[PDB]
Structures are given as structure tokens and as C-alpha cells.
Amino acid sequence: THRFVQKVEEMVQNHMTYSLQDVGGDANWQLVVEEGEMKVYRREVEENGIVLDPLKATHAVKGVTGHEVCNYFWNVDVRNDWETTIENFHVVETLADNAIIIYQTHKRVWPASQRDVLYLSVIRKIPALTENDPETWIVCNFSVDHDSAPLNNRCVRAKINVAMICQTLVSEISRDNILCKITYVANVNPGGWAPASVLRAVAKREYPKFLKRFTSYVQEKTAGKPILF
Ligand SMILES: CCCCCc1ccc(-c2ccc(S(=O)(=O)CCO)cc2)cc1/C=C\c1ccccn1
Numbered sequence: 001t002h003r004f005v006q007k008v009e010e011m012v013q014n015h016m017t018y019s020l021q022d023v024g025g026d027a028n029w030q031l032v033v034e035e036g037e038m039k040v041y042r043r044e045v046e047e048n049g050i051v052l053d054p055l056k057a058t059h060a061v062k063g064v065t066g067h068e069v070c071n072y073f074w075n076v077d078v079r080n081d082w083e084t085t086i087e088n089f090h091v092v093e094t095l096a097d098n099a100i101i102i103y104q105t106h107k108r109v110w111p112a113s114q115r116d117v118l119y120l121s122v123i124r125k126i127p128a129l130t131e132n133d134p135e136t137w138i139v140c141n142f143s144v145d146h147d148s149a150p151l152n153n154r155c156v157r158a159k160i161n162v163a164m165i166c167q168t169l170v171s172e173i174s175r176d177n178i179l180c181k182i183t184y185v186a187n188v189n190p191g192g193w194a195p196a197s198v199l200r201a202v203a204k205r206e207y208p209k210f211l212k213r214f215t216s217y218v219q220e221k222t223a224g225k226p227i228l229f
Pocket of ligand 1: 083085106109112113115117141158160162186188190194198199202203206207210
């Protein structure tokens with residue numbers, strides 16, 4: 001029980017309600033890039049001339065569990081092993097053993113000014129409602145206000161609502177028989193102004209690169225370890 005428990009519950013529930021839905025049949029999502037099981041979609045949205053384009057991706061990763069994927073996504077201690085777009089990050093506050101508030105700066109993308117972010121990051125297990133449903137592991141990263149926020153005059157403050165939502169299929173269980181189904185959503189307000197073409201090019205390049213890189217990292221770090229369901 002920290003002061004964000006209720007907000008966390010709301011953000012997680014919204015993602016469970018809305019973000020998990022399959023968008024194969026939904027023409028409102030534009031499928032931008034497909035590489036195998038990796039499917040990356042966006043909606044073209046601008047507010048006050050700033051690109052907000054919602055990002056939604058699915059993926060199916062052999063050999064790892066949702067629990068493992070989420071631990072690796074969440075655990076700050078391995079962040080620098082997979083992240084390629086971060087210049088700096090600091091843990092601002094520990095709320096609980098499954099929740100922290102993080103400040104980070106993104107590498108500058110010329111010619112836009114650098115962005116920073118301040119967000120609560122929480123990892124949660126959502127039990128299968130019925131014996132028919134999969135359990136879900138989720139990480140949610142969403143912007144919050146904080147006082148120990150750094151002054152950084154080089155940066156415009158972006159605001160994010162990201163979730164990595166994982167269900168695991170199992171087919172001695174070996175990694176050969178496990179598949180992790182990922183839905184990843186990112187809604188990013190870059191703040192300020194940045195050229196629309198730049199924001200779209202960054203999204204189109206960096207999201208598939210992240211998903212490929214990050215998932216491969218989890219496969220590589222877990223191979224030959226006992227499975228953490
Ligand atoms: C001019 C450039 C503006 C950059 C806008 C931007 C700010 C923040 C973020 C962001 C993206 C993912 C997360 S997370 O998944 O929670 C993991 C922790 O880092 C947190 C923040 C994205 C983006 C915009 C594009 C973009 C896309 C994939 C990689 C990098 N940048």
C-alpha cells in the first residue's frame with residue numbers, strides 16, 4: 001500500500017479491458033510492419049498538431065514465459081542490457097517491491113529537442129478469472145508527477161502510458177514447449193513540438209527494433225535456466 005495503489009489498479013484494469021483485444025479484424029488499426037509473429041500497428045492521431053499515434057504490437061516468442069518477459073522488462077538492473085534509446089535513468093522512488101517511479105532521458109533524435117520522462121513502473125500478475133482463461137503478467141509504465149523530478153533544460157517532458165501484457169501457452173515441461181504471447185501498447189505524448197515526420201520515423205524504426213531486440217534478449221538470458229512460470 002503506497003499512495004498510487006488505486007491509480008495503478010485503474011491503469012492495469014484499463015489495459016486488461018482494452019489493450020488485450022485482438023485488432024486483426026479492426027480496420028481502425030493500421031498494420032505498419034509485420035515480421036513473422038511480430039505485428040506492429042498504429043493509429044494516426046494528432047493533437048494540437050503534435051503526433052500522438054497510438055502504437056500497438058503483438059508478438060509470439062518461443063521459449064520464455066510471460067513472467068520472465070515481464071521481469072526482464074521491469075527489472076531496472078538489466079535495463080541497459082537491452083535499451084538502446086536511453087541516455088540516462090534514475091530511480092526516483094521505490095513504492096513497493098513491484099512498483100517504482102523512474103526518471104529517464106532519451107537520446108536526442110535530430111533535429112528535435114531531447115525528451116525526458118517521469119513514470120511509475122509496476123509489474124502485476126493477473127490471475128485467470130476462470131480455469132479456461134490464461135493468467136496474464138503485465139508491466140505498466142505511466143507518467144506521474146513527482147517533486148524529485150530533475151530540472152533538465154535540454155529536455156521536453158514526454159508523457160507515456162505503456163503496457164507489456166503477456167500470456168503464456170504450454171504445449172518435464174521444456175522451453176521447447178512454451179510460447180509467450182505479447183501485446184505491447186505505447187501511447188506517447190512527446191510534448192512540445194517535434195516534426196511529425198520525425199516522430200513517425202522514430203516510431204516506425206524504433207518500436208520493431210525494440211521488440212525484436214528485447215524479446216531476443218529474454219530468450220538469450222533465460223535459455224538453460226529453469227523455467228520461471
Ligand atoms: C523527438 C523524439 C521524441 C521521443 C518520444 C518518446 C519518448 C519516450 C518513449 C518511451 C518509449 C517506451 C518506453 S517503455 O516501453 O516504457 C520502456 C522504458 O524505456 C518509455 C518511453 C518513446 C518515444 C517515441 C518513440 C520511441 C519508440 C521506441 C523507442 C524509443 N522511442
